[model samples]
Target: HGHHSHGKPLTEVEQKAANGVFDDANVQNRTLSDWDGVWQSVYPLLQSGKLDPVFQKKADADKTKTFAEIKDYYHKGYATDIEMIGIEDGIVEFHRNNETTSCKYDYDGYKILTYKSGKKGVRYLFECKDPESKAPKYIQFSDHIIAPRKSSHFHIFMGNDSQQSLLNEMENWPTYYPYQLSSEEVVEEMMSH
Candidate 1:
């Protein structure tokens, strides 16, 4: 929902459990390295097809997207060849295919974005410190976490060196989790959604 629904609805008590959006407003700000760690791409878990159970649950709840449609949407959105990443001190090492490229990123700032749901999310932006760095020129992160804290998982978006261009990207948010997790743990985390 966009703004908090006016007046208490029938689901008032139950609604309290879904806190990803509103709770973010409580965060003052955050730095880029909060999610620093050796992270594995979650795209592989989905591609492995272990998340069908979760998609089945969401399809039942939303009743709009069929299980197949829901799956495809994420398949398109989360698709990526980047297998793993090591992020530390705003330095990111992208492990894509069989190649590894590392670069230093500096926090440029953040932007508050409103979605079709009428809810808003914060995207923290970063730029490669060296213009010649092999990494993508622009990168943004959204973890449903706006505060300065460690993120167990996160959604990342990237484009050339333009925040304007990056803001317009609504699809393909490659996500990652701590590399130490087993596929079962990752599947459990997906079910947590």
Candidate 2:
């Protein structure tokens, strides 16, 4: 809960809870155990080469660029339309100005989206909760190197503590600029282009 351009600011209660000042005892004890199990099943799919082809191709293409150059490219991308999908498992999808893409935790519980134009591709990491569960929450992170635009390289750390830390740090964190685009906005922009 925080400030926003299109919506009201977070209510007093929500602001407190967002900062880990929850009054409810149950809320404090709610751990990310369900997410941990989901990640455990997903990791094998990542390691067993199921997800290798997509990333490998990108890695090969990116070899020529220096690390700093890649970072600068991503900063200018300003990708948008980040969202989470709920199927039997879960999915995180987003759009750059150029392409619409998605990532899913496969039915077998595996990995993870991309872009390009005068508008460069934007890299994104979507952190999402277990979709099979009754409630689902999603967050998006991005970079030039780890998960680059139009590139297949993707990374997901499969540790419970790591996942928890990410959730705590990113979810509902205040932003100086708008971080996501509405579906309508994405479609309108895409059609216009």
Candidate 3:
């Protein structure tokens, strides 16, 4: 009853949808556990030469910078010493400083932020439910996904105080990838973009 058929050609609009071009074009309801599982820093992989080709491909299209410049930009933006994050059930565990701090969180809401380029992105927000939990008070995930898809990778913004403070944060967002992947596997996942 919808669009795809065996013989006839696809409409241009159908082609766009088929290609997943608008995959994240709208916001969808999400739960904190949608980001479940252990996620490790992507910046370290980028630092160690595994992500070189991915950035090289980006440099190919964007003459705004060469490979080195592009990599340098990410160096600052994706920097994280935290190493790993574990999100399961309703708790978020931050592995940093050679120790882990785990906290339970509840879904507060989401915010749609528009960039200077007039592009819009959604930040799925969570708030700590425990007063004594070591985790940040506010957590926001911008995975370039506004729907029910599992996180392939995500840019995280955190605030120890409030959601408003975290919302004010831009410029440098810490990025992470699935901890289950090897550096090689991680490279392919990243390069698919």
RMSD, every candidate, angstroms: 7.6, 16.7, 6.3
How do all models score by TM-score?
0.83, 0.23, 0.79
Tens digits of lDDT, candidate 3, 138-178? 88998755666566688888877888787787567898888
What is the Cα root-mean-square deviation between model 3 and the actual structure? 6.3
lDDT of 1 at 85: 86
What's the ranking of the predictions by TM-score, best on top?
A: 1, 3, 2
RMSD of 2: 16.7
**Residues 15-76 of candidate 1: C-alpha lDDT, one tens digit per residue:** 33133355444545677668788998878788888888888888999966799999999998
**Cα lDDT computed for each candidate against the true fold:** 0.77, 0.30, 0.78
lDDT of 2 by residue, 1-193 (tens): 4542333455675445333343333231111222221111122233343434434444567978654454333333322222222122344333333354444532221111211222221112234455543222333332122211121112222223433444334222211112244433333322331
Clashing residue pairs in candidate 3 (N, C-alpha, C atoms within 3 angstroms) = none
Consecutive 10-residue window with the lowest summed lDDT within model 2: 144-153
Top-TM-score structure, candidate number: 1
Better of 1 and 2 by TM-score: 1
